[PDB]
Design a protein around this ligand. Structure first.
Ligand code: SF4
Ligand SMILES: [Mg+2]
Ligand SMILES: [Mg+2]
Ligand SMILES: [Mg+2]
Ligand SMILES: [Mg+2]
Ligand SMILES: [Mg+2]
Ligand SMILES: [Mg+2]
Ligand SMILES: [Mg+2]
Ligand SMILES: [Mg+2]
Ligand SMILES: [Mg+2]
Ligand SMILES: [Mg+2]
Ligand SMILES: [Mg+2]
Ligand SMILES: [Mg+2]
Ligand SMILES: [Mg+2]
Ligand SMILES: [Mg+2]
Ligand SMILES: [Mg+2]
Ligand SMILES: [Mg+2]
Ligand SMILES: [Mg+2]
Ligand SMILES: [Mg+2]
Ligand SMILES: [Mg+2]
Ligand SMILES: [Mg+2]
Ligand SMILES: [Mg+2]
Ligand SMILES: [Mg+2]
Ligand SMILES: [Mg+2]
Ligand SMILES: [Mg+2]
Ligand SMILES: [Mg+2]
Ligand SMILES: [Mg+2]
Ligand SMILES: [Mg+2]
Ligand SMILES: [Mg+2]
Ligand SMILES: [Mg+2]
Ligand SMILES: [Mg+2]
Ligand SMILES: [Mg+2]
Ligand SMILES: [Mg+2]
Ligand SMILES: [Mg+2]
Ligand SMILES: [Mg+2]
Ligand SMILES: [Mg+2]
Ligand SMILES: [Mg+2]
Ligand SMILES: [Mg+2]
Ligand SMILES: [Mg+2]
Ligand SMILES: [Mg+2]
Ligand SMILES: [Mg+2]
Ligand SMILES: [Mg+2]
Ligand SMILES: [Mg+2]
Ligand SMILES: [Mg+2]
Ligand SMILES: [Mg+2]
Ligand SMILES: [Mg+2]
Ligand SMILES: [Mg+2]
Ligand SMILES: [Mg+2]
Ligand SMILES: [Mg+2]
Ligand SMILES: [Mg+2]
Ligand SMILES: [Mg+2]
Ligand SMILES: [Mg+2]
Ligand SMILES: [Mg+2]
Ligand SMILES: [Mg+2]
Ligand SMILES: [Mg+2]
Ligand SMILES: [Mg+2]
Ligand SMILES: [Mg+2]
Ligand SMILES: [Mg+2]
Ligand SMILES: [Mg+2]
Ligand SMILES: [Mg+2]
Ligand SMILES: [Mg+2]
Ligand SMILES: [Mg+2]
Ligand SMILES: [Mg+2]
Ligand SMILES: [Mg+2]
Ligand SMILES: [Mg+2]
Ligand SMILES: [Mg+2]
Ligand SMILES: [Mg+2]
Ligand SMILES: [Mg+2]
Ligand SMILES: [Mg+2]
Ligand SMILES: [Mg+2]
Ligand SMILES: [Mg+2]
Ligand SMILES: [Mg+2]
Ligand SMILES: [Mg+2]
Ligand SMILES: [Mg+2]
Ligand SMILES: [Mg+2]
Ligand SMILES: [Mg+2]
Ligand SMILES: [Mg+2]
Ligand SMILES: [Mg+2]
Ligand SMILES: [Mg+2]
Ligand SMILES: [Mg+2]
Ligand SMILES: [Mg+2]
Ligand SMILES: [Mg+2]
Ligand SMILES: [Mg+2]
Ligand SMILES: [Mg+2]
Ligand SMILES: [Mg+2]
Ligand SMILES: [Mg+2]
Ligand SMILES: [Mg+2]
Ligand SMILES: [Mg+2]
Ligand SMILES: [Mg+2]
Ligand SMILES: [Mg+2]
Ligand SMILES: [Mg+2]
Ligand SMILES: [Mg+2]
Ligand SMILES: [Mg+2]
Ligand SMILES: [Mg+2]
Ligand SMILES: [Mg+2]
Ligand SMILES: [Mg+2]
Ligand SMILES: [Mg+2]
Ligand SMILES: [Mg+2]
Ligand SMILES: [Mg+2]
Ligand SMILES: [Mg+2]
Ligand SMILES: [Mg+2]
Ligand SMILES: [Mg+2]
Ligand SMILES: [Mg+2]
Ligand SMILES: [Mg+2]
Ligand SMILES: [Mg+2]
Ligand SMILES: [Mg+2]
Ligand SMILES: [Mg+2]
Ligand SMILES: [Mg+2]
Ligand SMILES: [Mg+2]
Ligand SMILES: [Mg+2]
Ligand SMILES: [Mg+2]
Ligand SMILES: [Mg+2]
Ligand SMILES: [Mg+2]
Ligand SMILES: [Mg+2]
Ligand SMILES: [Mg+2]
Ligand SMILES: [Mg+2]
Ligand SMILES: [Mg+2]
Ligand SMILES: [Mg+2]
Ligand SMILES: [Mg+2]
Ligand SMILES: [Mg+2]
Ligand SMILES: [Mg+2]
Ligand SMILES: [Mg+2]
Ligand SMILES: [Mg+2]
Ligand SMILES: [Mg+2]
Ligand SMILES: [Mg+2]
Ligand SMILES: [Mg+2]
Ligand SMILES: [Mg+2]
Ligand SMILES: [Mg+2]
Ligand SMILES: [Mg+2]
Ligand SMILES: [Mg+2]
Ligand SMILES: [Mg+2]
Ligand SMILES: [Mg+2]
Ligand SMILES: [Mg+2]
Ligand SMILES: [Mg+2]
Ligand SMILES: [Mg+2]
Ligand SMILES: [Mg+2]
Ligand SMILES: [Mg+2]
Ligand SMILES: [Mg+2]
Ligand SMILES: [Mg+2]
Ligand SMILES: [Mg+2]
Ligand SMILES: [Mg+2]
Ligand SMILES: [Mg+2]
Ligand SMILES: [Mg+2]
Ligand SMILES: [Mg+2]
Ligand SMILES: [Mg+2]
Ligand SMILES: [Mg+2]
Ligand SMILES: [Mg+2]
Ligand SMILES: [Mg+2]
Ligand SMILES: [Mg+2]
Ligand SMILES: [Mg+2]
Ligand SMILES: [Mg+2]
Ligand SMILES: [Mg+2]
Ligand SMILES: [Mg+2]
Ligand SMILES: [Mg+2]
Ligand SMILES: [Mg+2]
Ligand SMILES: [Mg+2]
Ligand SMILES: [Mg+2]
Ligand SMILES: [Mg+2]
Ligand SMILES: [Mg+2]
Ligand SMILES: [Mg+2]
Lengths: 82, 208, 99, 7, 96
RNA sequence: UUGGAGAGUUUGAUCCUGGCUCAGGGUGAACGCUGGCGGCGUGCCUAAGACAUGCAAGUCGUGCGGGCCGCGGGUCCGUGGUCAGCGGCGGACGGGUGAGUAACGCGUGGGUGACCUACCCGGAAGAGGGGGACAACCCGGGGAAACUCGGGCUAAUCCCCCAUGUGGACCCGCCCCUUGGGGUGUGUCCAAAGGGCUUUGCCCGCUUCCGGAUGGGCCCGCGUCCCAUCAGCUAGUUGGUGGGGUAAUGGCCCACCAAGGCGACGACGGGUAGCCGGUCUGAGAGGAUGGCCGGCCACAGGGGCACUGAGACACGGGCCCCACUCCUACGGGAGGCAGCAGUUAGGAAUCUUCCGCAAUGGGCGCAAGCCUGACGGAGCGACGCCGCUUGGAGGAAGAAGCCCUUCGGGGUGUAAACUCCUGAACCCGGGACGAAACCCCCGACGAGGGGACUGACGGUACCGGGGUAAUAGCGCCGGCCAACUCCGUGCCAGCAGCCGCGGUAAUACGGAGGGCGCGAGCGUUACCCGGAUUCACUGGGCGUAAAGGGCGUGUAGGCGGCCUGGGGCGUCCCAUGUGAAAGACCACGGCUCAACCGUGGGGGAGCGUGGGAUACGCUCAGGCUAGACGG
RNA sequence: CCGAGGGUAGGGCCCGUGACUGGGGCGAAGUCGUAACAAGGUAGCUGUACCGGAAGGUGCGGCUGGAU
């Protein structure tokens, strides 16, 4: 399945993820299909999370599956607001 | 690390008075005003005509020994100015001046950059409220360099801030003696500082 | 788009197949001069209606056989045996190149 | 390599 | 030294025999039907041909044949039967 | 318009030519002397040699039947586990390696009316009746073992038939399209599987079909090293027909017929090499390179093979052959570190048999959760880059020692001593960001609320309090090239990158004093680019420096006069698609700075498409006479 | 039927090595002569041919990069 997950960039002890759509069989930091936003878990900058939300819903509509901790960062960005 | 050795021989070689000590630089005990010839057995012999390479090397060692900075950091700064926009001569000087340990000296907190380094290195300094113990910190416009609260009361800083009630400070700088504060106003222009150094001859040294 | 080429026919000696000799021009990547380079394509002539000297267009298509990957798309000119002679003289000059 | 050989 | 690979190997054998048996019948009845189609024997051919067609698509239900394989194999079976019976008489029954 | 330095050496001297040499930057480095700390990186380039031991792929009791075991009783159920078995799904991902491959392998742009895609999403339809097998278990031989044979019982989402046919598949008709695309009509054929709760309904699953999405296969244009002292190559070879085979095109495979296919625009052969984003250098053009990271390919001891399957011809699956090693009770059996550590061999040389699933990610599962040497971290190593220390101020016309001296003196040198100030390490105390989701709660198992548990790194970073003046080495000093004197030596011992030094007054050998340059580094060796405009496209030459073929004739090829028109191939312009991320670059920001890292901005060239321009080059057509040929 | 490979037989290419042999380069102070640079004491060079311890000589033709 196509999924929506965190591809850890950054450096050692300096986590910086990109919320990204990729194939589940692709490697974690591998070639993704599209970037839909970034996420700084350590909250070292005013905007440590950001989601397109329009695109995050397209892939969601066509069958992409978020991760469990990626589902939150799309919830916390209000992707699911009815 | 830094040069850490005898410092009057530097001035005697470079043929120019570099202010690397402190008060002694202004006294008649100054080695330069006492034996203004190069160190060693041959210093009093008659100098033979130097080469063009010698002239450029001598300028570079001059400028570098002024700041007490190692050749690595000296050239990495030089190369940064080469890439950036504008005249490389000024920018290389400005970034040299932007070093914290140079500001702390240029603000009279210490009487020698070599002493200003130990001030920064032992933490007795802060920047914009935060302690900063890195002599290489590139100070930006607007930063408020001050003495550490826990260190405001110390004989060396007082005696230095005392003798600073007298002097004025450069156009690009600001200082409040009573509160031990200081402010970096802007990036120094070329004419805002008169070093005994022809910076083009330092450019030309690296163009080889 | 299926690539479309143009070339003469240098061989009719196969069943339902003709050899189409395409040439192209391009500047030398280093020396700039415009140089010629040619290439033979084995084209599909299922009606066996094309003959020597015909200048034709071929179109990329699914494999008919090994090596056969283009179909003749349309005639363009006819009786250009002057180009065919150029090809044959060259191949003929190869006999004078051995040892 | 039979059987004797030539080499 | 172990695995469930041992198990997956045991299962592969069971499905190997299951697949082989089906394809055997598919080959047998098809030749059988085609043989009659040449003789024609028009009714008996088509009566067999259906049992071929039935077993073919019955294979594409599991992992024995792919859909397009069944289709391809069916296409050539009926295609061969008609052209043989056209050297003979009426098809009589069904499958056409 | 952000970009371009040169020097030594052929001569008595000169100009030129020309080679050699040096100063620069670079590295997965190694070697010598030396060595304090931290960060981020990074580390078998050789034997794709050989490997001891553990670990690197499993999971589901919400599919099924049992053996065992405890839990509540009636040996009956339920239950919890637990162990294999059956049955799912995963094991085709991820991880390693660079041997092979000069290839549609890769790159770049395209084609598929010639194709496939498990789990996911969306829409449509449906799940109705019967039957059956094999393990587990029971019984019997064999063995040191691995282990297996036989006979007999049984369940299921396991196997099979029948029915239903929204639909789908096939042959033949006609319709639209136009390579096998989308329709339609008759005949023919194909579906299913149940389980768990809270039960006139939900939930996880099943079944046929259409579409999406994603991941693939196949095909074509252009590009992709050295040798022509490899010049000819080819019988499934090249095409055709029929057929087999596959998801699918194809000589991919077979039968037959035809005699074709390729090559100086380098076929065939030989050598070397995984390719790319990029990396290094460079004024650029170019050259060199492809380790780490990302993309693709290839391989899994050497080979061949298929099976299972959505997908493999499958690294830790199966069969067979070979080479090797192993255990053995000597009858017989096992193994495949180019997974993570580790051993040995080779080599100048390359790491811990560490910690943890807490985080990201993956498999399975309703979920709890289980597995995860992927991964996150710790360890060793100045391998590299960055940051930091071995103190700071004061301190005599200036100690001792050692060096030079004209014997007056000069030097090391404010250097030390010494005085005061600071306070690396260390000691105490507190102590993290990374972690809020899954889950439970209310609502509706949703949107949205509120709640709880969890950290390997680590008692680490960091903060606070205290607190000692606390490693410096290496190269070089004839010219290039920055830095000079004394002694020893006497073409010796030695130096040396090039020119050259040493023959009894050596700034060139060796030591010393002093001096220059770098600094936990400094040098050396190897190799790459630069200087090298010395393969010259940018940007070179050939009378005598190396260089005009002994001379004609002429094939291919390269090039080609004046005028007019057609086309629009080159060429030029505009729009548009692609040009992944990373990197580089500019801006800002986060680790106290930096290295490192995050966010955003700017794009080209090349190729696909669409539109336009027609001077020049090209082609086609018509005319001319200045080139050329003829009378 | 095909088939890893094993086997028989005969070819081609490449690498290593080989009694002995051929010249080549290099090596402070060896032996022989003096061919070339001056008209270098026979102008030199040259293709070829023959000869000679050795440089070289001679013939035939060519060149001036030949003195006077
Ligand atoms: S100034 Fe006079 S005293 Fe201060 S350092 Fe230069 S020479 Fe020594
Ligand atoms: Mg760390
Ligand atoms: Mg993949
Ligand atoms: Mg740097
Ligand atoms: Mg304090
Ligand atoms: Mg330079
Ligand atoms: Mg049979
Ligand atoms: Mg099927
Ligand atoms: Mg230069
Ligand atoms: Mg020169
Ligand atoms: Mg010389
Ligand atoms: Mg000479
Ligand atoms: Mg000389
Ligand atoms: Mg002369
Ligand atoms: Mg002379
Ligand atoms: Mg010269
Ligand atoms: Mg030269
Ligand atoms: Mg030269
Ligand atoms: Mg170098
Ligand atoms: Mg070392
Ligand atoms: Mg690191
Ligand atoms: Mg480390
Ligand atoms: Mg090894
Ligand atoms: Mg390498
Ligand atoms: Mg290797
Ligand atoms: Mg070996
Ligand atoms: Mg071995
Ligand atoms: Mg484990
Ligand atoms: Mg089941
Ligand atoms: Mg079990
Ligand atoms: Mg992989
Ligand atoms: Mg790895
Ligand atoms: Mg490794
Ligand atoms: Mg790797
Ligand atoms: Mg390789
Ligand atoms: Mg080859
Ligand atoms: Mg070749
Ligand atoms: Mg290719
Ligand atoms: Mg391609
Ligand atoms: Mg492609
Ligand atoms: Mg499957
Ligand atoms: Mg699912
Ligand atoms: Mg039953
Ligand atoms: Mg039964
Ligand atoms: Mg049994
Ligand atoms: Mg036995
Ligand atoms: Mg038994
Ligand atoms: Mg039985
Ligand atoms: Mg009809
Ligand atoms: Mg039925
Ligand atoms: Mg049923
Ligand atoms: Mg292809
Ligand atoms: Mg090609
Ligand atoms: Mg065919
Ligand atoms: Mg073939
Ligand atoms: Mg045949
Ligand atoms: Mg024939
Ligand atoms: Mg060609
Ligand atoms: Mg090879
Ligand atoms: Mg290699
Ligand atoms: Mg290789
Ligand atoms: Mg260049
Ligand atoms: Mg550059
Ligand atoms: Mg390359
Ligand atoms: Mg690589
Ligand atoms: Mg690695
Ligand atoms: Mg890579
Ligand atoms: Mg293999
Ligand atoms: Mg091995
Ligand atoms: Mg094997
Ligand atoms: Mg193999
Ligand atoms: Mg199958
Ligand atoms: Mg494979
Ligand atoms: Mg496997
Ligand atoms: Mg295998
Ligand atoms: Mg293995
Ligand atoms: Mg076996
Ligand atoms: Mg026995
Ligand atoms: Mg045995
Ligand atoms: Mg036996
Ligand atoms: Mg056996
Ligand atoms: Mg075995
Ligand atoms: Mg085996
Ligand atoms: Mg290993
Ligand atoms: Mg090891
Ligand atoms: Mg070893
Ligand atoms: Mg060894
Ligand atoms: Mg490591
Ligand atoms: Mg985990
Ligand atoms: Mg992921
Ligand atoms: Mg997880
Ligand atoms: Mg799940
Ligand atoms: Mg395990
Ligand atoms: Mg572990
Ligand atoms: Mg790791
Ligand atoms: Mg190491
Ligand atoms: Mg270190
Ligand atoms: Mg001092
Ligand atoms: Mg004195
Ligand atoms: Mg003195
Ligand atoms: Mg003294
Ligand atoms: Mg003295
Ligand atoms: Mg936390
Ligand atoms: Mg979960
Ligand atoms: Mg409720
Ligand atoms: Mg503590
Ligand atoms: Mg403290
Ligand atoms: Mg204190
Ligand atoms: Mg104190
Ligand atoms: Mg001290
Ligand atoms: Mg040096
Ligand atoms: Mg000199
Ligand atoms: Mg130098
Ligand atoms: Mg000098
Ligand atoms: Mg003597
Ligand atoms: Mg001696
Ligand atoms: Mg020397
Ligand atoms: Mg050198
Ligand atoms: Mg002497
Ligand atoms: Mg002497
Ligand atoms: Mg002398
Ligand atoms: Mg000397
Ligand atoms: Mg020297
Ligand atoms: Mg010396
Ligand atoms: Mg450092
Ligand atoms: Mg080094
Ligand atoms: Mg340069
Ligand atoms: Mg060049
Ligand atoms: Mg070079
Ligand atoms: Mg050269
Ligand atoms: Mg050359
Ligand atoms: Mg040129
Ligand atoms: Mg030249
Ligand atoms: Mg001539
Ligand atoms: Mg000739
Ligand atoms: Mg011509
Ligand atoms: Mg022309
Ligand atoms: Mg013209
Ligand atoms: Mg055009
Ligand atoms: Mg990019
Ligand atoms: Mg910019
Ligand atoms: Mg660009
Ligand atoms: Mg374009
Ligand atoms: Mg167009
Ligand atoms: Mg055979
Ligand atoms: Mg064979
Ligand atoms: Mg054979
Ligand atoms: Mg065999
Ligand atoms: Mg042989
Ligand atoms: Mg010999
Ligand atoms: Mg003698
Ligand atoms: Mg003579
Ligand atoms: Mg004579
Ligand atoms: Mg003579
Ligand atoms: Mg003579
Ligand atoms: Mg002669
Ligand atoms: Mg004679
Ligand atoms: Mg004569
Ligand atoms: Mg003549
Ligand atoms: Mg004359």
């Amino acid at each position: 399945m196509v999924k929506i997950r965190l591809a850890r960039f950054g450096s050692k002890h300096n986590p910086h993820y990109r919320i990204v759509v990729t194939d589940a069989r692709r490697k974690r930091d591998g070639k993704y299909i599209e970037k839909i936003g970034y996420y700084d878990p350590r909250k070292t900058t005013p905007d440590w999370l950001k989601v397109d939300v329009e695109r995050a819903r397209y892939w969601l509509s066509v069958g992409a599956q978020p991760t469990d901790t990626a589902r939150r960062l799309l919830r916390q960005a209000g992707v699911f607001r009815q | 690390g830094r040069y850490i050795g005898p410092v009057c021989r530097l001035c005697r070689r470079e043929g120019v008075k570099l202010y690397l000590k402190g008060e002694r630089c202004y006294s008649p005990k100054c080695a330069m005003e006492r034996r203004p010839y190069p160190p060693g057995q041959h210093g009093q012999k008659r100098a033979r005509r130097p080469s063009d390479y010698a002239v450029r090397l001598r300028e570079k060692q001059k400028l570098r020994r002024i700041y007490g900075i190692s050749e690595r950091q000296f050239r990495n700064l030089f190369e940064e100015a080469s890439k950036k926009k504008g005249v490389t001569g000024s920018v290389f000087l400005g970034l040299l001046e932007s070093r914290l340990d140079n500001v702390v000296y240029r603000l009279g907190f210490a009487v020698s950059r070599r002493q200003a380094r130990q001030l920064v290195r032992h933490g007795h300094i802060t920047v914009n409220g935060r302690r900063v113990d890195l002599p290489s910190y590139r100070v930006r416009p607007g930063d408020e360099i001050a003495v550490a609260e826990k260190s405001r009361n110390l004989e060396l800083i007082r005696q230095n801030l005392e003798a600073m009630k007298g002097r004025k400070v450069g156009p690009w700088l600001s200082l409040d003696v009573e509160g031990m504060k200081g402010k970096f106003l802007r990036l120094p222009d070329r004419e805002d500082l008169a070093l005994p150094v022809n910076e083009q001859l330092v450019i030309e040294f690296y163009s080889r | 788009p299926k690539k479309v080429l143009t070339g003469v026919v240098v061989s009719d000696k196969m069943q339902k197949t003709v050899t189409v000799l395409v040439e192209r021009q391009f500047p030398h990547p280093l020396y700039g001069k415009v140089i010629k380079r040619s290439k033979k394509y084995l084209a599909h002539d299922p009606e066996e209606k094309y003959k020597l000297g015909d200048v034709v267009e071929i179109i990329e298509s699914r494999p008919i056989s090994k090596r056969k990957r283009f179909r003749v798309l349309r005639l363009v000119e006819s009786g250009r045996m002057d180009l065919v002679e150029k090809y044959l003289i060259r191949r003929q000059n190869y006999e004078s190149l051995s040892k | 390599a039979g059987x004797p050989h030539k080499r | 030294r172990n695995l469930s690979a041992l198990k997956r190997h045991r299962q592969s054998l069971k499905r190997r025999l299951r697949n082989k048996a089906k394809k055997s019948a598919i080959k047998t009845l098809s030749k059988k039907a085609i043989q009659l189609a040449q003789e024609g024997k028009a009714e008996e051919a088509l009566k067999i041909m259906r049992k071929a067609e039935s077993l073919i698509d019955k294979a594409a239900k599991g992992s024995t044949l792919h859909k397009n394989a069944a289709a391809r194999r069916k296409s050539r079976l009926m295609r061969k039967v008609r052209q043989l019976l056209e050297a003979a008489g009426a098809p009589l029954i069904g499958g056409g």
